[PDB]
Design an enzyme around this catalytic site. Structure first.
Site, PDB file in Angstrom:
ATOM      1  N   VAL A   1       0.840  -1.194   0.000  1.00 29.96           N
ATOM      2  CA  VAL A   1       0.000   0.000   0.000  1.00 29.96           C
ATOM      3  C   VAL A   1       0.877   1.248   0.000  1.00 29.96           C
ATOM      4  CG1 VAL A   1      -1.521   1.379   1.495  1.00 29.96           C
ATOM      5  CG2 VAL A   1      -2.113  -0.984   0.938  1.00 29.96           C
ATOM      6  N   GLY A   2       2.022   1.183   0.670  1.00 31.03           N
ATOM      7  CA  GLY A   2       2.885   2.350   0.728  1.00 31.03           C
ATOM      8  C   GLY A   2       4.273   1.997   1.213  1.00 31.03           C
ATOM      9  N   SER A   3       5.106   3.032   1.299  1.00 31.52           N
ATOM     10  CA  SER A   3       6.478   2.903   1.775  1.00 31.52           C
ATOM     11  C   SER A   3       6.941   4.261   2.283  1.00 31.52           C
ATOM     12  CB  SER A   3       7.412   2.379   0.679  1.00 31.52           C
ATOM     13  OG  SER A   3       7.136   1.022   0.379  1.00 31.52           O
TER      14      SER A   3
ATOM     15  N   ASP B   1      -2.065   8.501  12.794  1.00 29.72           N
ATOM     16  CA  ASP B   1      -0.735   8.953  13.175  1.00 29.72           C
ATOM     17  C   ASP B   1      -0.011   9.500  11.950  1.00 29.72           C
ATOM     18  OD1 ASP B   1      -0.675   6.459  12.003  1.00 29.72           O
ATOM     19  OD2 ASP B   1       1.107   5.787  13.097  1.00 29.72           O
TER      20      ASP B   1
ATOM     21  N   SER C   1       6.808   0.529   6.012  1.00 29.79           N
ATOM     22  CA  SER C   1       6.042   0.179   4.823  1.00 29.79           C
ATOM     23  C   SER C   1       4.827  -0.630   5.257  1.00 29.79           C
ATOM     24  CB  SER C   1       6.886  -0.614   3.818  1.00 29.79           C
ATOM     25  OG  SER C   1       7.589  -1.661   4.463  1.00 29.79           O
ATOM     26  N   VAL C   2       3.735  -0.496   4.506  1.00 25.45           N
ATOM     27  CA  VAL C   2       2.435  -1.011   4.921  1.00 25.45           C
ATOM     28  C   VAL C   2       1.861  -1.887   3.816  1.00 25.45           C
ATOM     29  CG1 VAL C   2       0.099  -0.423   5.653  1.00 25.45           C
ATOM     30  CG2 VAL C   2       2.026   0.989   6.385  1.00 25.45           C
TER      31      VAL C   2
HETATM   32  N1  LIG Z   1      -1.243   9.263   8.154  1.00 23.97           N
HETATM   33  C1  LIG Z   1      -1.339   7.970   7.853  1.00 23.97           C
HETATM   34  C2  LIG Z   1      -1.705   7.591   6.570  1.00 23.97           C
HETATM   35  C3  LIG Z   1      -1.800   6.243   6.263  1.00 23.97           C
HETATM   36  C4  LIG Z   1      -1.547   5.256   7.216  1.00 23.97           C
HETATM   37  C5  LIG Z   1      -1.648   3.885   6.947  1.00 23.97           C
HETATM   38  N2  LIG Z   1      -1.979   3.432   5.722  1.00 23.97           N
HETATM   39  C6  LIG Z   1      -3.175   3.777   4.921  1.00 23.97           C
HETATM   40  C7  LIG Z   1      -4.189   2.637   4.964  1.00 23.97           C
HETATM   41  C8  LIG Z   1      -4.788   2.589   6.368  1.00 23.97           C
HETATM   42  C9  LIG Z   1      -4.857   1.495   7.123  1.00 23.97           C
HETATM   43  C10 LIG Z   1      -5.415   1.714   8.326  1.00 23.97           C
HETATM   44  C11 LIG Z   1      -5.786   2.982   8.543  1.00 23.97           C
HETATM   45  S1  LIG Z   1      -5.404   3.848   7.184  1.00 23.97           S
HETATM   46  N3  LIG Z   1      -1.369   3.006   7.919  1.00 23.97           N
HETATM   47  C12 LIG Z   1      -1.023   3.404   9.151  1.00 23.97           C
HETATM   48  C13 LIG Z   1      -0.760   2.410  10.090  1.00 23.97           C
HETATM   49  C14 LIG Z   1      -0.944   1.088   9.703  1.00 23.97           C
HETATM   50  C15 LIG Z   1      -0.693   0.049  10.588  1.00 23.97           C
HETATM   51  C16 LIG Z   1      -0.247   0.335  11.871  1.00 23.97           C
HETATM   52  C17 LIG Z   1      -0.055   1.657  12.261  1.00 23.97           C
HETATM   53  C18 LIG Z   1      -0.308   2.699  11.372  1.00 23.97           C
HETATM   54  N4  LIG Z   1      -0.924   4.712   9.446  1.00 23.97           N
HETATM   55  C19 LIG Z   1      -1.179   5.644   8.506  1.00 23.97           C
HETATM   56  C20 LIG Z   1      -1.077   7.000   8.820  1.00 23.97           C
END
Ligand SMILES: Nc1ccc2c(NCCc3cccs3)nc(-c3ccccc3)nc2c1
Ligand SMILES: Nc1ccc2c(NCCc3cccs3)nc(-c3ccccc3)nc2c1
EC number: 2.7.11.24
Length: 333
Positions: A26-28, A164, A33-34
């Site tokens: 989804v991202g980096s 966050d 990275s997610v």
């Molecule tokens: N400002 C942002 C922007 C994107 C984010 C994102 N990925 C986008 C997809 C999402 C997954 C869950 C909530 S949003 N994921 C996470 C996150 C995912 C797993 C554990 C802790 C944080 N934070 C985000 C903070």
């Protein structure tokens, strides 16, 4: 104890319990990275974040501990929380990777605006949820400091969570590097967000740092006598006095066609003097949110021990404290 499996995602080897299936990037970024995934234990779509080089240095290790402590403490419907945290390591000695799991959100606030006006009913519901989560965050003595549409996630039922240019939504006392700002810097950001939802356009789209302050003063006027008294910087205070005075504008004439209760709330959020800004708790009781306000279901947080921020420890000490938090994690119901 859970069975793990390896897989090639991004540029690295993700090791992940078999409950999480169909990993998809989804991202980096510099700090992590997610991947999106499907949690077969719960049936939820989740986002799994693998921290990048979590213990490479003292700074990284304290960062990793800060991020895990924070996400473990947040337990509120309108704030991001942890579904799970895990490491493939079986002991502290082989502990080197940290994964965080949260509920997958489909879009952020930009994705639902698209430079179009939202209805007043919709803005009521969205701003109420932001303030509800903000009351919780502020009650833990935490300041967000970077509230903006991209840090606000929304699902298809319009349920919103705080996550966050960033300067478009920044409080003016941060723009001027004041040391002692308070929690109402976030209330300023919510005011900017609310204005953008009602109008469909950025309220203060500054092209650079100084232009941003220029646009803000054009709306809320030059500092008053009572605010100038509280400015300790002799250079700042002198410069402000040299400026042509500008009248504070009447928001009712700026936001034509808006709900008058919405205008009155924006007046109380977009005050130059941060000591005079409405708080999150006070804003929830504003008549604008009459159809959503419930004082019995606007909870506060448990006290959050942030004393670690003052500490200077070694890599292995931050790592061991982080390992303690992984082991002690209790999943939510
Ligand atoms: N400002 C942002 C922007 C994107 C984010 C994102 N990925 C986008 C997809 C999402 C997954 C869950 C909530 S949003 N994921 C996470 C996150 C995912 C797993 C554990 C802790 C944080 N934070 C985000 C903070
Ligand atoms: N109690 C308060 C309340 C607000 C304050 C504020 N707010 C920003 C006011 C301005 C923003 C833009 C031009 S003037 N700014 C400062 C400040 C600004 C520069 C250097 C040192 C302090 N102090 C404040 C103290």
């Amino acid at each position: 104890r859970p069975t793990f499996y390896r897989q090639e995602l991004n540029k690295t080897i993700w090791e992940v319990p078999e409950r999480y299936q169909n990993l998809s990037p989804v991202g980096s970024g510099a700090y992590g990275s997610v991947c999106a995934a499907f949690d077969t234990k719960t049936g939820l779509r989740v986002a799994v974040k693998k921290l990048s080089r979590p213990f490479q240095s003292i700074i990284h290790a304290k960062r990793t501990y800060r991020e895990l402590r924070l996400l473990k403490h947040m337990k509120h419907e309108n704030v991001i929380g942890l579904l799970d945290v895990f490491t493939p390591a079986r002991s502290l000695e082989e502990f080197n990777d940290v994964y965080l799991v949260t509920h997958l959100m489909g879009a952020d606030l930009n994705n639902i605006v698209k430079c179009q006006k939202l209805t007043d009913d919709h803005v009521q519901f969205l701003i109420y949820q932001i303030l509800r989560g903000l009351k919780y965050i502020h009650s833990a003595d935490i300041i967000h400091r970077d509230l903006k549409p991209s840090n606000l996630a929304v699902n298809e039922d319009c349920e919103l969570k705080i996550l966050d240019a960033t300067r478009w939504y920044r409080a003016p006392e941060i723009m001027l590097n004041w040391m002692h700002y308070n929690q109402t810097v976030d209330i300023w950001s919510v005011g900017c967000i609310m204005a953008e939802l009602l109008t469909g356009r950025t309220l203060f789209p500054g092209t650079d740092h100084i232009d941003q302050l220029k646009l803000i003063l054009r709306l809320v006027g030059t500092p008053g006598a009572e605010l100038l008294k509280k400015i300790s910087s002799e250079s700042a205070r002198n410069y402000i006095q040299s400026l042509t005075q500008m009248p504070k504008m009447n928001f009712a004439n700026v936001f034509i066609g808006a709900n008058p209760l919405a205008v009155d709330l924006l007046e109380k959020m977009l005050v130059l003097d941060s000591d005079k800004r409405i708080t999150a708790a006070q804003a929830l009781a504003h008549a604008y949110f009459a159809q959503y306000h419930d004082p019995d279901d606007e909870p506060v947080a448990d006290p959050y021990d942030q004393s670690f921020e003052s500490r200077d420890l070694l890599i292995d000490e931050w790592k061991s404290l982080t390992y303690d938090e992984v082991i002690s994690f209790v999943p939510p119901p």
